[PDB]
Paper text:
Peptide hormones, such as parathyroid hormone (PTH), neuropeptide Y (NPY), glucagon (GCG) and secretin (SCT), which adopt α-helical structures on binding their receptors, play key roles in human biology and are well-established biomarkers in clinical care and biomedical research. We set out to develop general methods for designing proteins that bind peptides in helical conformations. We show that by extending RFdiffusion8 to enable binder design to flexible targets, and to refining input structure models by successive noising and denoising (partial diffusion), picomolar-affinity binders can be generated to helical peptide targets by either refining designs generated with other methods, or completely de novo starting from random noise distributions without any subsequent experimental optimization. The deep learning methods largely converged on the overall solution to the helical peptide-binding design problem—groove-shaped scaffolds with helices lining the binding site—that the human designers chose in the initial Rosetta parametric approaches.
We used the same design strategy to generate higher-affinity binders for NPY and GCG. Using weak parametric binders as a starting point, we extended their binding interfaces and redesigned their sequences to generate a 231-nM-affinity binder for GCG and a 3.5-µM binder for NPY after screening 96 designs. As a first experimental test of partial diffusion, we started from our parametrically designed Inpainted binders to GCG (with 231 nM Kd) and NPY (with 3.5 µM affinity). To gain insight into the structural rearrangements generated by partial diffusion that contribute to the affinity increases, we solved the structures of the original Inpainted GCG binder and the partially diffused higher-affinity GCG binder. Both designs were very close to their design models. Alignment of the two crystal structures on the structurally conserved C-terminal residues (16–29) of GCG showed that in the partially diffused GCG binder a 2.7-Å shift towards the target in the binder backbone enables an isoleucine to fit into a pocket previously occupied by a phenylalanine side chain at position 13 (left inset). Similarly, at position 16, a 3.6-Å shift in the backbone allows a tyrosine residue to pack underneath the peptide and form a hydrogen bond to the peptide backbone where previously a serine could not make any contacts (right inset). These backbone movements and accompanying sequence changes increase the interaction shape complementarity (0.62 versus 0.67) and contact molecular surface (431 Å2 versus 522 Å2; computed on the crystal structures).
Author numbering:
A (entry chain B): 173 to 197
B (entry chain A): 1 to 162
The structure:
């Protein structure tokens, strides 16, 4: 089973939000 | 300092976004019965993204080694490894999936090459996981300890679906 296009987009959004948190903390 | 790590990571994110669009195009090409060479060219571009991601992750790793050797701030050193862990996550996520995609479609050439990147990314994932656990034990900062925990969960999230 392959993960959906949107689930792939969420994983990228979470990683970006994580990186964004690191540089504003 | 960390600014150069962010710059490399933005490149990886734009490469990951292109990878997702190609994955989208690849799905629609299969759904419409596109010719095999049309799928190969889409798979080749994804492979080139996987290789550029690996090159960036190796670059990111060298910059983190410089931060770990020179920066006296333990929280800044931990943030460098946390940023590098995100890069390794991006590399493993796309390379591991590209290998599985190429295998399911029957492209052994592209599956073997993607597999080589995934195997290298896997050893990078294991190495950064060891450093992440050492950060939770060595850095008292609750948010940096919390961040190391999540970055581990992030890295392990790929192998769960696989």
């Amino acid at each position: 089973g392959f993960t959906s296009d949107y689930s792939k987009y969420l994983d990228s959004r979470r990683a970006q939000d994580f990186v964004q948190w690191l540089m504003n903390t | 300092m960390l600014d150069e790590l962010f710059s490399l990571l933005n490149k990886m994110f734009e490469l990951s976004d292109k990878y997702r669009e190609l994955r989208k195009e690849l799905r629609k090409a299969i759904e419409s019965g596109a010719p095999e060479e049309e799928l190969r060219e889409l798979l080749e571009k994804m492979l080139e993204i996987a290789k550029k991601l690996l090159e960036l992750t190796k670059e990111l790793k060298k910059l983190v080694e410089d931060v770990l050797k020179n920066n006296p701030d333990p929280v800044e050193r931990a943030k460098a490894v946390l940023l590098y862990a995100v890069g390794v996550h991006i590399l493993y996520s796309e390379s591991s999936e590209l290998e599985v995609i190429a295998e399911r479609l029957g492209f052994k050439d592209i599956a073997e090459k993607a597999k080589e990147i995934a195997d290298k990314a896997r050893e990078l994932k294991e190495e950064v996981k060891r450093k992440l656990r050492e950060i939770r034990e060595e850095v008292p900062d609750p948010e940096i300890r919390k961040a190391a925990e999540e970055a581990i969960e992030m890295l392990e999230s790929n192998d769960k679906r696989l």
